[PDB]
């Protein structure tokens, strides 16, 4: 009867506490810290609260005066719990879908908002990213709405260099072409590049400068080394050819 | 009876696990990575949880003490699940409607917020865009609200060039007209352009400069090459005609 | 009985698939692309899911063990669908109301947020706008909260020109008046203008300049040509009268 | 019986279509455009959908297999409709309350966010504002959260003028006082002003300037003309008295 | 019976229209404008709609075919009305609570976000604030989340003056002290101040300047006059003592 | 019966009005202003509305035609009231939790967003903060999401001083060390400091300067006086040692 | 009967007040302040309100006129309470999940938004962080959405130094290499570093400068000391080698 059902609740409560002891062993893993005492206390309190609620519900059902006040209170508490748990299920679903489309793997370079780093590990609710300063960022999946991946597909560079307006375009463009040529005859750099450079010439005009563009396409994650080498060669050849940097201009009175 | 219904639940649970094995084969595709072990474990856990919930519901219905506590808990969990799944159905509906109006195809150049690139593939929940730096962006449909497409219809250029205030408009405007004339007699460039240039003359006055505007209408995705050629010719002809760039001015004491 | 009702469900399912084939013909229109295969598959899957849900509901109703678990799951799914469809009905209602008040027509120049262009077509959920760069923007109605229309009513110009503080106001104001006078005696420009210019004189003082204002009222969409002509004439007459542009000033030690 | 009720539904459907024809005449007004064909088609489709839903509901009620699937679908659709209609009733209530407190009339100058213009007309959902560039802005009431009105009450000006630090305050303040004095003896300007000027003297110190403040109180919508006249007189009297504008200062080495 | 109840509905509808006529007299007050015709029409339409809904509900209840479609539609409409009325009850509650704590009175100087002005009147939903330019701002209570009041308690000034780095602190600090001394011996200003000045000396170092701080505590709303007088005296005494303003510095080559 | 219950409602209504008279005495306190007449009228109107609603509900229950229209209207009104009261209960809970953790006391210096001041009093819904300009800010608890407290624990200073690149680090660092030494031998300042200074040397390099860092740890709320004294001593010793401030540099042609 | 149940409610109310007295002892702890009188009064008021609500509910259930008005009011109050408690359960769940993944411990350096500091203590709803200025920040868990931890894993430095464009890269790069060499031969600094420096050479070109990059990997929380030492050595060796800082350039007329 009611007493037999009440004993079943107590038996299940002990099993949940025994399951909490199993969770203590799981929590006992060195990876998730060693201060699991607080977490265990919360689980025990929750189990006790659930057992007390079940017992009170049984008593009220056997009372005959309707559980309406207490039932309404429990319903309000459950509604609050459901309202507060939107974000968690949001992270779970978002992460499940992200791994479904092979959006993120471990070790690749990504960009989530204002952060760029390498993925270290993915939990059920968040993803760990290691920044170039050594900081470890924990980003929940629902916080992620748009991200970029640098290992998928191919890589490319687009380089723009500003040249002073007073000079002529033919000499500066030839200097840039020569700088790219010296880069091409280098062996491992040319191994990184895939194909031939794309010279665009003047791509803009300013009040004191004009800009020249040259674009490549390289191996994934190799664009930055090529960019740095190109910058060094461009500086060297601009110095050789006498190309001037943009200079401010003014008049007096 | 209850036992026969319980056996049916177990039979369906095995079928779902067999369906999960079929999903494992689907997940086994090289495109969606190779670490599908985690996804399979989640599906198995979900199937086990569903089977346990069904069995407990049957037992409680056959108990006679009302499923009210457990039923309310299940209802709260379902409410949380429904609340957390708003974004997913939002992406699904938004993508379905976007493909309905032929808003986006594969390979075209688009602009979604601060990102400009070529569409590579569209999933049920997101769209992949390839940037000019080689990064691969995953953008969910609900995150997309307003976007532009450069392949629909036509293309056009509007070019504004700043000339300092001290010179006269007739000489600078004539120099710009001559620069456009040299561009027109070029053959492939004229093939890109559709029609005749639209000279607007002075379109603004600054404290140290005035601006001249000339606009074209070209083939789709061909506006940038025409713009670069026009910039080069404008610089050359401005140098030829002696037109000066804007210069700062000050007085002493 | 139940079997007769089940046969009716199957008959309706085939009719929906036949209706999907009718939608395939509608989707077959060249305007909405040619890759309608994906859309048809989704419709077929939805019809199959609906038929299966109806059959399972009938079986459960004829079972006698209550549909409560499955009914609650279906209710949660429907709640999620309703929650995710807020935006779509929002666009539908907003567009219906916008067309009710004659807010937007096709071909007129509008400004929706940071975008200015001519309306090309309006769907049930969005509106297409053509920018001056040739890009085609798709803007849903709910994303629209405030917009401006340049074809309703009239057009006007308010022109402010900065003159440096050192000169006198009477000479510069007279030069501006003469510049407007030359503009007035032109024939087509005066045809664009409706009425007489409104001279306001000095309307502000800066540390190194003062500003003069003149305003007109012209035909719709004709304000920019008048503004450009006024700017050219103002520059010419300021050069003629010897009016100086604002100049920076400093002192040494 | 059921057939008699079904005939009543058909009779009401025709009346709604006849009411749509009456709405067509209302829509036929030249003010709300002439392309009301699309709106009429939507109304006809909605009436047909409502009639079909009513007929299906009657058939299902007379079937005996419960309307539960279809009733739940209709409930979900109604929930989505109610969720998507929050903004519309928000505009209706906000506008009703705004006209209740006499916040806005037709023809007055207002400022709603970043827009300043004269109210032209108010609908049930929006308000039309005419900008000084001739653009016509449609602003829904719910989008309005805070606005200012320039015709209610009185008007005032607060004028701050920057004077170089190196000069003395007594001479510059006397020059400003004389400039206000000349303004006062003018007749229509003095008619605009209500009372006497309020001289505050130095109200701030900068690294290269100090500022003098004088404030008035004038008729509504007349503050700007008084401000412009005061600016012109202040410039003239500052030139007469030899008061210098703020000047940058530096030292070498 | 049903007819007797229907007659009661009609009798109440006329009473509501008579109550609307009473509201017309209330609306007839000159303060809430004179165009109350539109408001009366809306009230009459609402009363007619309510009467029609009640009659249709009675007819449907006496029909026997369940009001379920129409009842569900009415429930959806009521849900939309409740959803759209969140802001109004929010303003009502916020204003009621604000007047409970004596946060705002009429005539005092407040600062609500980017607006500073004097409270003119408070409605049930908003508050009117008069700006120093004469504009009248209507701010709903829910839009208010944080505001400041200048009449509660006391007033104070904190004055920071920048002196160039090259000079010595003792001379400049003594000059500031003397400037405060001249202010103190003035009688009405000293009546405004409550106590003695608080000299803090150097409170910061810049690349080309250092700043000195002096703070007071005065009567409410009297801080600005004291600040202006202090600024004037500080300028005068800095000129007397030969204290220099911050000056830019550079070097050549 | 119904009449006896109706008399009970009237008796309770009078008691609520008598309770409102008790609230009038409470509102009669000089602290919560003296214009409590408006609040009392609102309470009386609410009591009358509640009594009328109860009477109408009783009449409808005794009518037999279902309260469904009026009951649904009351339910919608209650739903709107509950929706609009989210913020109030949010403030109540947030404040209760804030006082639970001893986050804020009265008189301490706090920083809530862009505001820094001393707490004056805490209500059930908001907290009053006194700014250094004398303004009194009212901040609801829900508006508070993150704040800092300067009285808990200790205080510290981190001082960075910029020295131009041209000079040598050893001389400037020695000058800073000597400046700190003179500060240390002062007696009350050394009483404020707790321990020894932490010299960090160069902590950054700019194009025209390098920065030196020295950090302390002092008593709570005493960091600013120590900072000002350190700034004065640093300026004095930099002047003594001939250390130069950062200076701009350029080249000609 | 009803009286026996009413006595049980009174007995439980006293037990709750006795439990409040136990909470008073808990609140009596010196850590959570000493003004717990206000909190106790709120608990007593809540207990009294709950007891009164239970008694009124029992009386209404024994009345026979339905609790519908009062039950609906209680339901609306509970709905408001549930709506206002979303944030609290959000913090609880977020903190529980954060501690689960070992995201934060006590004493480590973290970065939560614009705040960087050391964790001092974690409550159930918030986390205390000590800033370098001595301020104590209280941050709820729901307010936390993304944070970084500096003690997990390893630490690294990336140093960029700008060199004037006019000089040559080989000399400046050699000077930087020598500066790193002197740093390496230092003993405790080399103990901090883990491995060898990574020289990247030129990594960017500006209009007046080029930048050189060198990166390390050091012990956790030791990156800043290494960075400061590297900056000092780089300045010293740049001075030794005659490397110039970036300099502005202009031309006259």
Concatenated DSSP letters of F2-24: HHHHHHHHHHHHHHHHHHHHHHH
The full 3-state SS of chain C, as one line of letters, equals: CHHHHHHHHHHHHHHHHHHHHHHHHHHCCCCCCCCCHHHHHHHHHHHHHHHHHHHHHHHHHCCCCCCHHHHHHHHHHHHHHHHHCHHHHHHHHHHHHHHHCCCCCCCCEEEECCEEEEEEEECCCEEEEEECCCCEEEEECCCCCCEEECCCCCEEEEEEEEEECCCCHHHHHHHHHHHHHHHHHCHHHHHHECCCCEEEEEEEECCCEEEEEEEEEECCCCHHHHHHHHHHHHHHHHHHHCCCCCCEEEEEC
Chains A and B touch (3+ CB pairs under 8 A): yes
Q: Chain C residues with CB inside 8 Å of B201's CB?
A: 228, 232
Is the distance from CB of G55 to CB of G12 less than 8 angstroms? no
A67 Cβ contact list (under 8 Å, min separation 6): A57, A60, A61, B68
Whole-angstrom distance between the N-terminal and C-terminal Cα of chain A? Answer: 105
Is the CB of residue D6 less than 8 Å from the CB of residue D58? yes
Say which residues have a Cβ less than 8 Å from residue E95's Cβ, sequence separation at least 6.
Answer: E122, E124, E125, E127, E141
Among chain G residues, the shortest Cα distance to F208 is held by G245
For D228, nearest residue in chain C (alpha carbons): C203
Q: Do A205 and B234 touch (CB under 8 A)?
A: yes
d(CA D183, CA D194): 13
Can you tell me whether residue G58 is helix, strand or coil? helix
Mark whether C and F touch (3+ CB pairs within 8 Å).
no
Q: Are strands A109-112 and A115-122 parallel, antiparallel or unpaired?
A: antiparallel
Residues in chain B within 8 Å Cβ distance of A79 = 76, 79
Facing residue for F133 by CB, picked from E61, E98, E223 = E223
Instruction: Note which residues in 12-51 of chain D have CB less than 8 A from chain E.
Output: none
- Tell which of B91, B163, B207, B219 to mutate to test the C interface (max C CBs under 10 Å): B207
Distance CA G218, CA E135 (A): 61
Q: Which bin fits C186, alpha (ψ -120 to 50), beta or left (φ > 0)?
A: beta
| SS (HEC) of chain E | CHHHHHHHHHHHHHHHHHHHHHHHHHHCCCCCCCCCHHHHHHHHHHHHHHHHHHHHHHHHHCCCCCCHHHHHHHHHHHHHHHHHCHHHHHHHHHHHHHHHCCCCCCCCEEEECCEEEEEEEECCCEEEEEECCCCEEEEECCCCCCEEECCCCCEEEEEEEEEECCCCHHHHHHHHHHHHHHHHHCHHHHHHECCCCEEEEEEEECCCEEEEEEEEEECCCCHHHHHHHHHHHHHHHHHHHCCCCCCEEEEEC
Nearest to A134 among G67, G153, G250 (CB): G153
Would the CB atoms of F165 and G251 count as touching at under 8 Å? no
Query: Coil, strand, or helix at residue F67?
Result: coil
Measured in angstroms, the CA of G174 and the nearest CA of chain A are apart by 15
Any chains having at least 3 CB pairs less than 8 A from chain G are: A, F
D residues 196-215 lying closer than 8 A (beta carbon) to E: 200-205, 207-208, 210, 215
In angstroms, the CA E127 to CA C3 distance is 68
Number of CB pairs, chain B paired with chain C, less than 8 A apart: 154
Q: Which residue of D has its CA nearest to E31?
A: D102
Q: Tell me if chain C has a CB within 8 Å of the CB of D161.
A: yes
- Taking the alpha carbons at both ends of chain D, their separation in whole angstroms is 105
Q: For B88, which of A83, A93, A165 is closest by C-beta distance?
A: A93
G246 contact residues in F (CB cutoff 8 A): 207
- The phi-psi region of residue E134 (left if phi > 0; otherwise alpha if psi is between -120 and 50; otherwise beta) is left
Resolution rounded to one decimal, in angstroms: 3.2
Experimental method: cryo-EM
Whether F167 has its CB under 8 Å from any CB of chain E: the answer is no
Classified as helix, coil or strand, B136 is strand
Question: In terms of DSSP H, where are the helices of chain D?
Answer: 2-27, 37-61, 68-84, 86-100, 169-185, 187-192, 223-241
- What whole-number distance in Å separates Cα of residue E166 and Cα of residue E209? 8
Sheet holding E155-164, edge to edge: E155-164, E209-218, E198-205
Chain G within 8 Å of F147 (Cβ-Cβ)?
yes
| Inter-residue contact F139 to E147 (CB < 8 Å) | no
Of E38, E69, E125, the CB nearest to D57: E69
The burial of C37, by beta-carbon neighbours within 10 Å (0-12 exposed, 13-18 middle, 19 or more buried), is given as exposed
A&G contacts, CB < 8 Å: 155
Taking the CA of residue D42 and the nearest CA in chain C, the distance in Å comes to 10
User: G149: which chain A residues are within 8 Å (Cβ-Cβ)?
Assistant: 135-136, 138
* F150–G140 CB contact, under 8 Å: no
Distance CA F106, CA F123 (A): 11
Chains touching chain A at 3 or more Cβ pairs under 8 angstroms? B, G
Which residues from E are below 8 Å from F68, CB to CB? 57, 67, 71
Q: Quick check: helix, strand or coil at residue D185?
A: helix
- Quick one: C167 exposed, middle or buried, by C-beta within 10 A (0-12, 13-18, 19+)? middle
State whether residue D207 is helix, strand or coil.
Answer: coil
Q: Do chains D and C touch (3 or more CB pairs under 8 A)?
A: yes
CA angle C206, C212, C215 (to 5 degrees): 140
Do B157 and B227 contact (CB within 8 A), yes or no? yes
Residues from chain A that touch B228, judged by Cβ atoms under 8 A, are 200-203
Burial grade of A71 (CB within 10 A; 0-12, 13-18, 19 or more): middle
Nearest chain F residue to G60 by CA distance is: F5
Q: Which of residues 69-128 of A touch G (CB under 8 A)?
A: 69, 72-73, 75-77, 79-81, 83-85, 87-88, 120, 123, 125-126
Q: Closest-CA residue in chain D for C251?
A: D249
Positive or negative CA dihedral for A141, A147, A152, A153? positive
**CA–CA separation, C129 vs E102, rounded Å?**
52
- Are C153 and D161 an interchain contact pair (Cβ–Cβ within 8 Å)? no
Q: Decide if B80 contacts A73 (C-beta within 8 A).
A: no
Name the residue among B206, D145, C114, B44 with its Cα closest to residue E143: D145
SS3 F117: strand
Q: How far apart are CA D93 and CA A249, in angstroms?
A: 60
Nearest one of C47, C49, C63, C52 to C2, comparing CA atoms: C63
With 0-12 CB in 10 A as exposed, 13-18 as middle and 19+ as buried, what is A214?
buried
CA distance E46 to E34: 21
Q: 3-class DSSP state for residue A193?
A: strand
Residue E242 neighbours by CB distance under 10 Å: 10
How far is it, in rounded angstroms, from Cα B183 to Cα C33?
36
The count of other CB atoms within 10 Å of the CB of residue A52 is 12
Q: Which of G88, G132, G235 sits opposite F93 (nearest CB)?
A: G88
Q: Name the minimum distance, in Å, from the CA of B190 to any CA of chain C.
A: 18
Is G64 in CB contact (< 8 Å) with chain A?
A: no
Q: How far is C51 from chain B (nearest CA, A)?
A: 19
What's the rounded Cα separation, in Å, for the pair D211 and C77? Answer: 67
């Amino acid at each position: 009867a009611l007493i037999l059902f009440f004993s079943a609740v107590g038996w299940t409560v002990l099993a949940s506490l025994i399951e909490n002891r199993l969770a203590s062993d799981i929590h006992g893993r060195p990876l998730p810290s060693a201060r699991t005492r607080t977490l265990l206390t919360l689980f025990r309190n929750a189990l006790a609260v659930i057992i007390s609620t079940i017992t009170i519900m049984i008593v009220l059902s056997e009372i005959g005066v309707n559980i309406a006040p207490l039932l309404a209170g429990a319903g309000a508490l459950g509604l609050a719990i459901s309202f507060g748990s939107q974000t968690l299920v949001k992270d779970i679903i978002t992460g499940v879908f992200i791994q479904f489309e092979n959006g993120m793997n471990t070790g690749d370079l990504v960009t989530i908002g204002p952060l760029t780093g390498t993925v270290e590990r993915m939990s059920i609710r968040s993803v760990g990213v290691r920044q170039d300063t050594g900081a470890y960022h924990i980003i929940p999946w629902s916080s992620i709405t748009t991200f970029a991946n640098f290992v998928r597909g191919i890589g490319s560079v687009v380089a723009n260099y500003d040249v002073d307006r007073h000079e002529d375009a033919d000499k500066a463009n030839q200097a840039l072409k020569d700088a790219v040529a010296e880069l091409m005859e280098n062996e491992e750099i040319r191994g990184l590049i895939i194909g031939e450079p794309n010279f665009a010439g003047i791509v803009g005009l300013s009040n004191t400068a004009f800009t020249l563009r040259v674009s490549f396409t390289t191996l994934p994650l190799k664009q930055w080394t090529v960019r740095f080498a190109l910058d060094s060669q461009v500086k060297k050849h601009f110095d050789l050819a006498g190309v001037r940097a943009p200079v401010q201009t003014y008049q007096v009175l």
